[PDB]
């Protein structure tokens, strides 16, 4: 076996398991899901003795997994290498937990002002906290100044990037926070109007938006004198955002 050497022996047979997903979503202003999918991978930090035989199972709540691209050791069952390695990549598109709901509200004031209001609605267990929340609201190219106040977090107008950045430390599920802006516009040519860019989001949530959960991870070493009841197994679900936009 060319991915694992013989004779490995650890004292504390531990097992770290990270489930890493990236939720992608495009949503109309009215809340209709235009396109959405999750891209995920499962990495395993293995510290087991000898040449163990491992069986990884899950709910395949339920979830269907569209694509699969496995490591070279599998057949699920596998002899895992020593250390950190990627066990599998996957992608689902059905029954995806959308962790946040961006609700834009833009109101023209003649041809000079732009009163804008954006509401975030967290949509998960209130016992869990989302972290590293960023909401990017793009401003028109003909902006002289913006005026924003917000309840939770802090907001700044990065005029160079031509957008408003709103950052929130944490936010529990089943909650809502809002931000309100006044945008002063220079006069310009009404001709082109402007291509309304979407409102982007970035967050971290301690669960798999695909609903995936680890049913079992069995370890089997027949030669050595340890069984699966002796393995200190851990699992860590982390979901990041990728392309998370709402048409405004």
């Amino acid at each position: 076996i060319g991915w694992r050497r013989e004779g490995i022996k650890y004292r504390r047979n531990e097992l770290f398991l990270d489930v890493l997903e990236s939720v992608n979503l495009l949503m109309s202003p009215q809340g209709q899901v235009l396109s959405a999918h999750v891209s995920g991978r499962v990495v395993m930090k293995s510290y087991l003795s000898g040449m163990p035989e491992c069986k990884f199972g899950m709910n395949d709540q339920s979830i269907a997994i569209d694509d699969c691209t496995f490591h070279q050791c599998v057949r699920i069952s596998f002899i895992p290498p020593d250390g950190e390695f990627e066990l599998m990549r996957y992608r689902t598109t059905k029954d995806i937990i959308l962790p946040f709901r961006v609700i834009p509200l833009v109101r023209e004031v003649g041809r000079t002002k732009l009163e804008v209001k954006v509401v975030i609605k967290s949509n998960f267990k209130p016992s869990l906290l989302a972290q590293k929340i960023e909401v990017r609201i793009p401003t028109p190219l003909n902006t002289s100044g913006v005026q924003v106040i917000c309840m939770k977090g802090k907001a700044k107008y990065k005029a160079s990037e031509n957008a408003i950045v709103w950052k929130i430390k944490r936010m529990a599920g089943m909650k809502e926070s809002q931000i309100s802006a006044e945008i002063e516009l220079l006069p310009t040519n009404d001709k082109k109007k402007w291509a309304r860019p979407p409102i982007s989001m970035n967050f971290e949530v301690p669960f798999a938006p695909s609903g995936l959960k680890v049913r079992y991870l069995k370890v089997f070493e027949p030669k050595l004198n340890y069984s699966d009841h002796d393995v200190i197994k851990w699992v860590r679900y982390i979901g990041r955002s990728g392309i998370y936009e709402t048409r405004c």
């Binding site: 770290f16 398991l17 680890v214 197994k233 851990w234 699992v235 860590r236």
Partner: peptide
């Protein structure tokens, strides 16, 4: 950080 597998 991590949680134990039940």
């Amino acid at each position: 950080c991590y949680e134990q597998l039940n």
